[PDB]
Symmetry: none
Subunit: 30 residues, 3 copies
């Protein structure tokens, strides 16, 4: 019951990927 948090955390984890993607460009541009 009240398993509304389960989907939210999965989507929230995706946020880390976004930050990691931005950092990738930084490494290629000093």
């Amino acid at each position: 019951g009240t398993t509304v948090l389960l989907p939210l955390v999965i989507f929230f984890g995706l946020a880390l990927l976004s930050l990691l993607f931005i950092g990738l460009a930084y490494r290629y541009q000093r």
Copy 2:
């Protein structure tokens, strides 16, 4: 049908990770 697009876009991000992981293996391992 209800907010079906929300989970679809989250899964899409998952595919992007595959590109980021595959690209790392090539650079860190010919």
Copy 3:
């Protein structure tokens, strides 16, 4: 249910990002 595997595979991708996250701290540590 019917699509129990669908969310499981999406979560499975998140596990890989966990290892990548470890490398981020190392680079920012030294």
